């Protein structure tokens, strides 16, 4: 039972080296029960004749596993295609000594394949490890349009979704293009301060020179690239301080031979005993059939736990990855490279001396360039936000209060001067209230700069699957916050589960709930008049509100929505006049503002107690840098009786 294998190579000197290596590795066992062999050929330019030569190798010996390498020719992607396709028809295992392209990782197009060197996707994982070292959490992922680009983006997406913090505005550019300045200029606005790139070498030089023209290689920033972005001629356009990384002992592959035969040896003596092996597919013509045991041999070889090759302990993944290969981190230390870190799977050891960042500062630079002029959005609410027209002199009434202290007012732009019907009138109004004073305190504490402007929709905003069916984009104010129209939200805004996914909330500063309003009396939600709606009494709420979602997610209460959706004023405090008009009897709304209405006005009564608990709070975009501080500030105010004093001044004396 002479078990025979083969291996094709490139330089015809590594062929002699392979012959010597295989005959030396034959000395592992010589018990005469099992023997080994080898046959080697060299490459050729034409693909079709090369594949015919592979078929000649197939017929010339009942082969067991072919091995492939790369020649010094620069035709990268056209190198390993024919052998895999031809040998896949008989489930003949193939071993790629060195090929880093992404496409081969898919076991559905090259169903028989095994690799020892990891593809370009796996190095992305290393970045994540590095990303956790210095606490960077806002990224700018820059990638090309090639299949490797999609693979890298997908790998980084799943690895981020493991911890599931965020990605930040990935943008892809076409391959082999010039003047990429448009996308870079578009993405230069964002607050993130670290970029990641993985594309072609010429594309790397082009993006390097374009960023140099746009002045992005300067101080403070840092962006790191993959493996081939710091090779070839890309160094002729690269600035100092960009991180780089390569594999420990690649592109040699002679030592890699010393691994491959090894594992296949560790395979052969473990396979010939299963039950009924007895044959590989003999012939290369006419015999239209597959090997009866191909999948078995491939699966057994895949799970092989090899002991020690030249390149450490080598295993395989579910698809044939490198399984804990090594990586060396080099720095562009004044147009050179210095090995600063060793990545072996669990971390990167900073055993080196010093790392220089693109800015020249020798300390670890953080990203998240903090802005100074925010874009604050607000909404008209009776006891919290007061809006008035201005005196044509340039502002509105500057006068003392009951106590004599000046009530501070700002100037906010905003609406169209008429909510239901008007083209637009974007005019400045004078703008003062409780939340305005709280924002004044916050700005004084944290050195802010504010430009307040109202919403155009006039509504808070819920989920709405529009007639153009798609993902339900957020409505009005929340869409303005998410799209980038606004940057921070200060208003009497509820905190609910449906909003917690995309927004980060601060600690609540005023506890409040839901309560009924009538003009006398009434009861909570128990009466049959509400269990069974009556033609006399009318129950209406504010449309596009959190209460709409609350009544749109209750199983038993669904029918009340049937009433509520029938007629509900898509309106505001204007709908308050409904209770004055004796049309709408019951108005279900938030406790604080509706209770202030009872005290300020007359003949308006609130019945019973609350039936729901929530809270107001300042919200910001997902994982904004300010959160902690802002929250802390609010809590500190709550300690000093500031909130109680504001409560007194604004809604007590009434």
């Amino acid at each position: 039972k002479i078990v025979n294998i083969g291996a094709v190579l490139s330089t015809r000197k590594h062929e002699q080296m392979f012959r010597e290596a295989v005959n030396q590795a034959n000395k592992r066992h010589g018990s005469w029960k099992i023997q080994l062999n080898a046959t080697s050929v060299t490459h050729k330019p034409n693909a079709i004749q090369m594949a015919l030569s592979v078929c000649e190798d197939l017929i010339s010996s009942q082969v067991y596993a072919i091995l492939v390498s790369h020649p010094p020719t620069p035709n990268d992607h056209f190198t390993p295609t024919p052998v895999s396709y031809t040998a896949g028809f008989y489930r003949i295992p193939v071993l790629g000594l060195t090929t880093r392209m992404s496409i081969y990782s898919d076991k559905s197009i090259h169903l028989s394949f095994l690799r020892t060197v990891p593809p370009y996707s796996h190095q992305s994982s290393v970045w994540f490890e590095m990303m956790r070292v210095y606490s960077w959490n806002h990224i700018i992922l820059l990638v090309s349009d090639d299949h490797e680009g999609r693979a890298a983006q997908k790998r980084l997406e799943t690895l981020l979704e493991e911890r599931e913090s965020k990605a930040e505005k990935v943008l892809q550019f076409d391959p082999g293009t010039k003047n990429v300045t448009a996308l870079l200029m578009e993405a230069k606005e964002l607050e993130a301060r670290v970029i990641i790139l993985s594309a072609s070498e010429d594309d790397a030089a082009t993006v390097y020179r374009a960023a140099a023209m746009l002045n992005m290689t300067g101080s403070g920033y840092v962006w790191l690239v993959g493996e081939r972005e710091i090779s070839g001629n890309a160094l002729r356009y690269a600035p100092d301080g960009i991180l780089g990384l390569q594999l420990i002992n690649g592109k040699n592959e002679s030592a890699h031979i010393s691994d491959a035969v090894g594992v296949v040896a560790q395979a052969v003596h473990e396979l010939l005993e299963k039950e009924n092996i007895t044959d590989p597919p003999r012939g290369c013509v006419g015999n239209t059939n597959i090997w009866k045991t191909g999948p078995l041999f491939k699966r057994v070889l895949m799970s092989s736990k090899y002991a020690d090759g030249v390149t450490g302990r080598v295993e395989f993944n579910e698809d044939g990855d490198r399984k804990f290969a090594n990586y060396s981190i080099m720095n562009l230390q004044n147009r050179k490279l210095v090995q600063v870190g060793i990545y072996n799977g669990t971390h990167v050891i900073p055993n080196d001396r010093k790392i220089i960042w693109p800015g020249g500062e020798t300390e670890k630079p953080r990203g998240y360039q903090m802005s100074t002029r925010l874009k604050i959005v607000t909404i008209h609410q009776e006891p919290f936000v007061y809006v008035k027209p201005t005196l044509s002199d340039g502002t509105c009434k500057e006068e003392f209060t009951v106590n004599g202290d000046p009530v501070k007012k700002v100037i906010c732009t905003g609406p169209n001067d008429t909510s239901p019907g008007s083209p637009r009138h974007t005019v400045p109004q004078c703008c003062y209230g409780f939340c305005i004073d709280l924002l004044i305190k916050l700005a004084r504490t944290m050195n802010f700069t504010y430009e307040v402007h109202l919403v155009a929709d006039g509504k808070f905003g819920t989920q709405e699957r529009v007639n153009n069916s798609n993902k339900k984009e957020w409505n009005g104010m929340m869409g303005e916050l998410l799209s980038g129209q606004a940057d921070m939200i200060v208003a009497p805004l509820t905190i609910n589960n449906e909003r917690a996914q995309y927004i980060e909330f601060s600690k609540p500063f005023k506890y409040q709930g839901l309560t009924i309003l009538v003009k006398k009396r009434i009861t909570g939600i128990n009466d049959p008049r509400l269990r069974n709606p009556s033609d006399k009494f009318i129950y209406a709420t504010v449309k596009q509100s959190s209460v709409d979602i609350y009544f749109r997610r209750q199983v038993e209460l669904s029918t009340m929505y049937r009433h509520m959706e029938k007629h509900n004023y898509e309106s505001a405090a204007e709908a308050i006049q409904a209770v004055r008009d004796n049309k709408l009897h019951a108005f279900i709304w938030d406790s604080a503002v509706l209770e202030f209405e009872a005290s300020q006005k007359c003949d308006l009564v609130t019945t019973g107690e609350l039936f729901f608990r929530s809270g107001f709070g300042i919200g910001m975009r997902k994982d904004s840098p300010w959160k902690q501080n802002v929250s802390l500030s609010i809590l500190k105010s709550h300690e000093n009786g500031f909130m109680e004093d504001l409560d007194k001044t604004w809604v007590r004396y009434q």
């Binding site: 330019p45 034409n46 693909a47 079709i48 004749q49 699957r465 069916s469």
Partner: protein, 214 residues
């Protein structure tokens, strides 16, 4: 715009000859009213035999399989449960002569469509030996000209990946006579039907009949 209360996902591996021991228990454990499967034809035969051994085959359960399996439409295989649903493109009229009539006609019409407006007849490539043509010439647009096409009322609108988009296709099922029969189709609009109710054709069974009044 629906709920789709999905039950669960299960992954199976079987070497049918000997290693299917744990697969039996794993297939016993499940419980769901709708099953959708995905495997090869021989793998389908062993999987359905194992399911029949397990017992989760009753008429109260329905199987769903893509066109990848059940390729041999012209021959109803054995050990297959009656009343499953599979979906195929327009191929009932297909045959050797049908494919012959389709292919050359579409290729020639595509060759002439680009000529219809300032065009010329194409020429073949070099050979399989010289390995020529590194660049993509203007004639590649001729290949791009083979995207939009129409004939015989059937829409052969294509896709940038090498397949057809907006297709006309039918949904099939196995009746009690062990022969593939037409059940419905999707003619560019919404689903059609020939049997408005599922006949659940064939003792410790399910889907009991319930009669009521309002």
């Amino acid at each position: 715009h629906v709920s789709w209360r999905l039950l669960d996902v299960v992954t199976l591996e079987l070497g049918p000859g000997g290693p299917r021991a744990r697969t039996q228990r794993l297939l016993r454990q499940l419980d769901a009213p709708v099953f959708v499967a995905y495997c090869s034809r021989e793998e389908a035969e062993v999987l359905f035999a194992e399911a029949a051994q397990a017992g989760l085959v009753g008429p109260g359960h329905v199987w769903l399989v893509p066109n990848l399996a059940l390729g041999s439409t012209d021959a109803p295989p054995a050990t297959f449960p009656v009343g499953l649903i599979s979906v195929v493109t327009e191929s009932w009229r297909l045959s050797l002569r049908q494919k012959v009539r389709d292919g050359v006609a579409i290729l020639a019409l595509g060759a002439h469509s680009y000529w219809r407006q300032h065009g010329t007849l194409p020429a073949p490539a070099g050979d399989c030996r010289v390995h020529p043509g590194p660049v993509s010439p203007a004639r590649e647009a001729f290949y791009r000209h083979l995207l939009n096409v129409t004939w015989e009322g059937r829409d052969f609108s294509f896709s940038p990946g090498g397949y057809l988009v907006q297709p006309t296709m039918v949904v099939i099922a196995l009746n009690r006579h062990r022969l593939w029969e037409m059940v419905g189709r999707w003619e560019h609009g919404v689903l059609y039907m020939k049997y408005p109710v599922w006949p659940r054709y064939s003792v410790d069974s399910r889907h009991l009949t319930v009669a009521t009044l309002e």
